[PDB]
Each structure stands twice: as structure tokens, then as C-alpha cells.
């Protein structure tokens, strides 16, 4: 059969799965990168900050991660 709904469906699925994989790798690389960039915990005045140094030295709340 011609099956328009399956030829477009299968093609869309290939792109969807290839693309979700790319997006998942992307956020994985950014979470990996920031753990390395800012590998420390904050202090009493930067209580949830990522902080670039072993002491405060470079804190922000615009790049928070778990």
C-alpha cells in the first residue's frame, strides 16, 4: 500500500530519535562541563552557589546545578 501515514511516520521517528539523542548528549555535556568548571560547594554567604574556587572566589547563582 501507499501508506502515507507510515512512510512519514517512520521518517519522523528516525529524526526524532536521532535528535533526542543529540539533545540528551548536549545537556549531559553541559552538566559534566560545569561540574568540572565549578567543582566546589558554597559558603555561608553564598549558600547554594557553584563558586569557581575552593573558597568563595567566583560565585554566581545564574549557573546552578545539582
Amino acid at each position: 500500500w501507499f501508506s502515507r501515514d507510515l512512510n512519514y511516520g517512520k521518517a519522523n521517528s528516525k529524526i526524532w530519535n536521532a535528535t533526542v539523542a543529540k539533545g540528551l548528549k548536549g545537556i549531559a555535556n553541559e552538566n559534566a562541563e560545569i561540574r568540572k568548571m565549578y567543582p566546589y560547594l558554597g559558603y555561608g554567604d553564598f549558600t547554594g552557589a557553584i563558586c569557581k574556587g575552593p573558597n568563595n572566589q567566583g560565585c554566581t547563582y545564574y549557573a546552578n546545578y545539582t
Binding site: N17, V20, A21, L24, K25, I27, A28, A32
Partner: protein, 292 residues
């Protein structure tokens, strides 16, 4: 329905100085992304196929070993006195062989390095056997982990986890089914004496003395243990047995406790096992091992 519904039970477990510390020296952690519902892992002609009938099935190097019975962990919970294999919290729904009756929580991987976080399934379901009844749901509170790290050199480090509270029993780290075509069955003893060929029985139980085991028609697979939990705070003579079961069906297991003890607990936390798997011709396999 009682057969298709998942559940969990809450208990209060507050015990103090009667809890020998079984030191969970090995753990598993991940830094990779999630995936959809299949894994296709390969490198250096080493393939692992997870067909999503259950999270791992086939493997080999242009060969296969079996259609079922892929690597799995399985916890045999506390028994009345080791009478029947009833309370088997098995990672794989091997009995169905098709309907993946296991809840999967995370499908993590990167190329060459899959992970896995899954729940168990009780192999017997809601029936009764012999004279002993069993659990109510089909899935218990125990969870499992796998991490398979393929190293470029043909070494594939395989880690598993079992997480079960207040346990007392027999935990299966890996069940593997090699092909029937494995006439050579050898192990290296920790005394570095020699490789021993043990083909007279087909009922070989290797204890600590067995350092690494290998089997092959001519192309070989090796299994080298890396780590397993033990009571490492006091090092008492606790019922902790690490051994193989080497019969046509191959199983790597560890016992945590006797069926009945005086009065002991266990933390019941996360426990992992580290096994080094590697492949190639018998020559390359033995050559790598003998580096030790």
C-alpha cells in the same frame, strides 16, 4: 487485580548495636544520558545486544552464546531454611521469555558504556509451592543496577547492584549461559601455581582460591573478580561466602548469611559487585591474565 499491579511495603526497622557492618566496598555511579528502549553496544567487534525483551541478552565477537539467560543479578531473599527457590527477586523475566514484566526506571547509556536501573520481578508470582506461600505483588522493593564499561583492549568491566533492606541470604551476582561448545574449562589459583583444567566433573565450585576462570572451545572468555562486599570493620568469621557455581549453567554468587543465625542484622543498603570480563583467543586471554 493482584497480578498486574505494582506495590511496595513500608516497615519500621530501628536496631542499634546488633548490626554487623557488611562493608559495601563497591558501588556504581553514572555520568551519562538516558535512552529510549534498546541498547546497541559495540566496540572492537565485541557486541552486547539488549533487545528490550529485558535489559541484556546477547553478546559475542561474531559469535553468540545463547538465546536466553543473559547476564542478570538475582536476589534470593531470606528462606525458611533454603528449602525452595521461592523468593527470587530476579532482574530478568526469564520465565516469560517475551513479555518484559519488569519495571525499568532509567535507561542510561553512552556508546560503549551502557547503564541500567531496574526493579526486580518475583519469578513465582502469587502462587504457592510445596508447603510455603510467598509474596503478594509481582515486583518487590528490591532494585538492580548494571554498568558495563568496554575498554578498548577488549576488557569489559561489568558491575551490578542489589539494594534490599535487612537481608539474610543468597545473592546471585551474575547468571551467564555460555554455549555448550566450551570443552576447555580452566582456572588460575591464587597460589600462582598453574592453570588447572577441571573437566572431570562439570560440577566445579571455585572458592577464594580461584583467582580467575576461563572457558573456551578455542576462542575464550575470561572472568576475573574485582570486588565484593565483606564485613571489613571487625573482620569476624561472618557467614560470607564468595564462590562460583560452574555447571552447564554458570552462576556467580555470594552468600550473606545462614538461613538461621543467633540474632544479627545487616544495614540493608546498596551493595555492588565488580567483575572484570574480557574476550579474545585463549592465547590473548591467558596472556592478559598472566600479567598478574
Amino acid at each position: 487485580k493482584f497480578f498486574k499491579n505494582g506495590n511496595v511495603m513500608y516497615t519500621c526497622n530501628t536496631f542499634s548495636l546488633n548490626v554487623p557492618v557488611n562493608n559495601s566496598i563497591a558501588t556504581i555511579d553514572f555520568a551519562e544520558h538516558v535512552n529510549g528502549a534498546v541498547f546497541k553496544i559495540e566496540y572492537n567487534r565485541v557486541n552486547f545486544i539488549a533487545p528490550s525483551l529485558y535489559p541484556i541478552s546477547g553478546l559475542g565477537t561474531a559469535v553468540v552464546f545463547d538465546l536466553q539467560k543473559g547476564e542478570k543479578a538475582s536476589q534470593r531473599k531470606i528462606t525458611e531454611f533454603g528449602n525452595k527457590d521461592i523468593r527470587i527477586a530476579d532482574e530478568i523475566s526469564d520465565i516469560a521469555a517475551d513479555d518484559h514484566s519488569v519495571l525499568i526506571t532509567t535507561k542510561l547509556m553512552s556508546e560503549s558504556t551502557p547503564g541500567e536501573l531496574s526493579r526486580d520481578v518475583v519469578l513465582n508470582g502469587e502462587i504457592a509451592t510445596g508447603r510455603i506461600n510467598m509474596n503478594t505483588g509481582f515486583v518487590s522493593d528490591i532494585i538492580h543496577t548494571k554498568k558495563i564499561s568496554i575498554i578498548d583492549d577488549g576488557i569489559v568491566d561489568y558491575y551490578v547492584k542489589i539494594n534490599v533492606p535487612a537481608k539474610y541470604s543468597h545473592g546471585i551476582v551474575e547468571v551467564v549461559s555460555g554455549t555448550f561448545l566450551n570443552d576447555i574449562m580452566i582456572h588460575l589459583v591464587r597460589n600462582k601455581n598453574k592453570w588447572a583444567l577441571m573437566d572431570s566433573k562439570m560440577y566445579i565450585v571455585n572458592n577464594t582460591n580461584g583467582f580467575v576462570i576461563a572457558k573456551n572451545p578455542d576462542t575464550a572468555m575470561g572472568v576475573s573478580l574485582l570486588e565484593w562486599p565483606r564485613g571489613a570493620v571487625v573482620f569476624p568469621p561472618y557467614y560470607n561466602f564468595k564462590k562460583f557455581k560452574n555447571v552447564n549453567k554458570w552462576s556467580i554468587s555470594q552468600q550473606i548469611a545462614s538461613c538461621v543465625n543467633t540474632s544479627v542484622k545487616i544495614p540493608g543498603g546498596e551493595y555492588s559487585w565488580k567483575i572484570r570480563l574480557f574476550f579474545g583467543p585463549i592465547w590473548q586471554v591467558q596472556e592478559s591474565i598472566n600479567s598478574v
